[PDB]
């Protein structure tokens, strides 16, 4: 039970990474290897790449909210958000990437948490003035999925997604 | 040739009609406006597929046109702002509907870039528009804009707040 879990969690650790840094080219392969696993212990896990896709976004969206709550801890609120919808932006646009090659969306409990998340994030913000008070979670939350879908078909989708989150949430203005 | 004229007329109102009903596009009601009967418009355009790509032609070509009019009416942000939110709208509603029956062809995509190029660099030697971002960015931004709001009721509306709020920025 012991070496059962802790291969899982290797397994589960190894996938999002692997996915996170290739995105569209992620390697079965290299999650194994890097997992310290066999294709049978691998698949005994994970019967289908549906189950191990499913299981690397529920990781994610845990991180995604635990980094929501750090970077409150760490940093003025307009800065929290504007980290935090990049990050989510760029998530989205590696992990379609992936699913896409790999087989590909979010279950209702991950977008019922992501949302929690971005809401809780904009309101600080805007109650302390910093960000526009006309905007609203589902909004913002819209555009950072809307450059995922953008960005994943994209040679260099992080970057990408990074680039038009950084025009999306700071404007076109002249500084 | 007298068929050309009809053609014209055909994708004209053909442009027209998906832009303001999208999926629920009336074939009757186009052929009515294009002046021209049911079988004229089929022999000219033997599916509805076929119809739509050379709607994408029109409307890209509109949209080439409207960035020269915007210039003319408007300061270069401003200018640049109205142009990224009616290729947001045509990519909601307009490319959207192609999901009922893809995608620009190729050079109607440079096409477009080559316009917003323009808009930009205007708006960039005025100093209203940050100097970092590029045409690619920009039309990308839009096509962004365009996936978050089609299929959706009140698409248009959605594309254009979506549009407003990204090119505004968080601030203030």
Same mark, same amino acid.
């Given at each position: 039970?012991?070496?059962?879990?802790?291969?899982?969690? #290797?397994?589960?650790?190894?996938?999002?990474?692997?996915?996170? #840094?290739?995105?569209?080219?992620?390697?079965?392969?290299?999650?194994? #290897?890097?997992?310290?696993?066999?294709?049978?212990?691998?698949?005994?896990?994970?019967?289908?790449?549906?189950?191990?896709?499913?299981?690397?976004?529920?990781?994610?969206?845990?991180?995604?909210?635990?980094?929501?709550?750090?970077?409150?801890?760490?940093?003025?609120?307009?800065?929290?958000?504007? #980290?935090?919808?990049?990050?989510?932006?760029?998530?989205?646009?590696?992990?379609?990437?992936?699913?896409?090659?790999?087989?590909?969306?979010?279950?209702?409990?991950?977008?019922?948490?992501?949302?929690?998340?971005?809401?809780?994030?904009?309101?600080?913000?805007?109650?302390?003035?910093?960000?526009?008070?006309?905007?609203?979670?589902?909004?913002?939350?819209?555009?950072?999925?809307?450059?995922?879908?953008?960005?994943?078909?994209?040679?260099?989708?992080?970057?990408?997604?990074?680039?038009?989150?950084?025009?999306?949430?700071?404007?076109?203005?002249?500084?």
């Amino acid at each position: 039970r012991a070496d059962a879990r802790r291969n899982y969690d #290797r397994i589960i650790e190894a996938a999002a990474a692997e996915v996170a #840094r290739h995105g569209a080219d992620a390697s079965l392969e290299e999650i194994a #290897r890097r997992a310290g696993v066999g294709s049978a212990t691998l698949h005994r896990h994970f019967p289908s790449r549906w189950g191990l896709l499913q299981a690397v976004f529920q990781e994610r969206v845990a991180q995604l909210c635990d980094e929501a709550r750090s970077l409150a801890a760490e940093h003025p609120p307009a800065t929290a958000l504007t #980290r935090w919808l990049t990050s989510l932006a760029v998530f989205g646009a590696v992990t379609r990437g992936a699913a896409r090659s790999l087989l590909a969306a979010l279950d209702s409990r991950c977008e019922q948490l992501l949302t929690e998340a971005g809401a809780d994030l904009l309101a600080r913000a805007q109650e302390d003035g910093t960000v526009r008070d006309d905007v609203t979670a589902l909004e913002l939350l819209s555009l950072a999925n809307a450059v995922s879908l953008a960005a994943e078909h994209t040679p260099d989708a992080a970057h990408h997604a990074t680039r038009l989150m950084g025009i999306a949430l700071g404007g076109l203005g002249a500084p």
